[PDB]
Structures are given as structure tokens and as C-alpha cells.
Structure 1
Amino acid sequence: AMALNIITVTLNMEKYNFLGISIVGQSNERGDGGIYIGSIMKGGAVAADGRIEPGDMLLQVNEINFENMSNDDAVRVLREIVHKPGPITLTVAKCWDPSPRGCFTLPRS
């Protein structure tokens, strides 16, 4: 496994009070997959920063690991986090390939 790129973005929730993203889950039979950025909407904290992009894998939010987390939990946790005031730090990977197994694996085809 190697990373194409890993970035850490601190969002000022004081200047933009909502994140402005959707999340998408991928998983296969084998437990591979994760939580990924779906849409990024203009006007939100994530769009203003400009660095996170659709298809990036969410690795961590604040101090919480998102790499082995059900969709239900990912959605609930992100809301708990947005709900309370204060900064939000998102760590994401830029993925080589958008398949469940593909974020940290170079395409072979």
C-alpha cells in the first residue's frame, strides 16, 4: 500500500457554520472500503478550503478514526461533531483508484 497524497484540513466552523459535504460508503465482502467524500457544495467550510475533492477517503475527523467505521456510525459521528461548536480537522487520502480495494493500491489492469 502507498498513498497518492494525504492532507489534513482544519475548518473554521466560526466563518462557515456547516461543512457542506455528503459522504459515500464503499465496502466489499472482504471488509475492504471506507468512508469517502461524495459532493462538495459551494458555501460550506470544505469548498472554501478547496483542497478536499469528491472521492477522497476520510481517514480521521478530529481524534476519531474513520477507516473501520460503518456508514451508520460515520454519519452519526460526523453530525455529533458538526452539532457542537468548534473547529473540525479532516484528514483525507487522495485515492489511486475509487474501488473498495483501490485507495492505496496502484491500478493493475
Structure 2
Amino acid sequence: SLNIITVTLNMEKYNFLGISIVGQSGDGGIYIGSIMKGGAVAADGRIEPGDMLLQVNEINFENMSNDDAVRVLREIVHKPGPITLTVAKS
């Protein structure tokens, strides 16, 4: 059942992850609701809608509000450098 992958995106060629996130959390969780064309995530191809977002760049997402998750993602994406996401596959 459990299928967890860690992927690193070098954000050299992209300005945004190109994801929407829904829900919050050992009940519930933060999920990829949608993936947008021209984003780093779509280009990489490994992360899909329905994947649960666990960790971004050693910041844990498992017990975090959706509001705070959006803030953190905006903060991370706006600064230069590779982004490492750990997700649980659907």
C-alpha cells in the first residue's frame, strides 16, 4: 500500500512548481489537487494529482494547515535553488 518517493527539481528552467494543494492533516493530509502545464512538477512527471505531500526541503507537511502549506510553498518557490518534495503515491 505505502509508496513514498523523494524527487529533486532543479528550478533553473521553471519559476513555479505548478501545483494546487487541497486538504490538511494521522487523519486526512495535504494532497496535490491539480498539476499545471509549464510548471516544474508537470515537466518532471513523477508527482501526480492525488499524491499526498509529506515534506518539502526538510520542512515536514504532515501536521500543517492548508493555509500555512500555501505560505511555505510560496516562500520556498520565490527563493532560488532546487526543491526536494517527498510524497505518498495514491
Count of residue correspondences: 90
Query: Unaligned stretches of 5+ in structure 2?
Result: none
User: Cα offset for 1:4?
Assistant: 3.1
Aligned-CA RMSD value: 2.3
2:24–2:64 Cα contact (<8 Å) kept: no
Instruction: Report sequence identity in percent.
Output: 99
Q: Which residue does 2:66 correspond to in 1? A: 71
Query: Unaligned stretches of 5+ in structure 1?
Result: 95-108
Instruction: After superposition, give the CA deviation of every residue in 1:11-53 in whole Å (9 maximum; x if it has no partner).
Output: 11111121111001145xxx61111001111111000110111
Supply the distance in 2 between the matched residues of 1:8 and 1:18 (Cα, whole angstroms). Answer: 18
User: Cα offset for 1:72?
Assistant: 1.0
Supply the distance in 2 between the matched residues of 1:73 and 1:25 (Cα, whole angstroms). Answer: 12
Q: What TM-score comes out, normalization by structure 2 length?
A: 0.91
Q: What TM-score comes out, normalization by structure 1 length?
A: 0.76
Supply the distance in 1 between the matched residues of 2:31 and 2:44 (Cα, whole angstroms). Answer: 17
3-state SS in 1 of match to 2:63: coil
2:6–2:84 Cα contact (<8 Å) kept: yes
2:18–2:41 Cα contact (<8 Å) kept: yes
* 2:29 pairs with 1:34: yes
Supply the distance in 2 between the matched residues of 1:26 and 1:66 (Cα, whole angstroms). Answer: 9
Supply the distance in 1 between the matched residues of 2:10 and 2:34 (Cα, whole angstroms). Answer: 19
Supply the distance in 2 between the matched residues of 1:17 and 1:7 (Cα, whole angstroms). Answer: 23
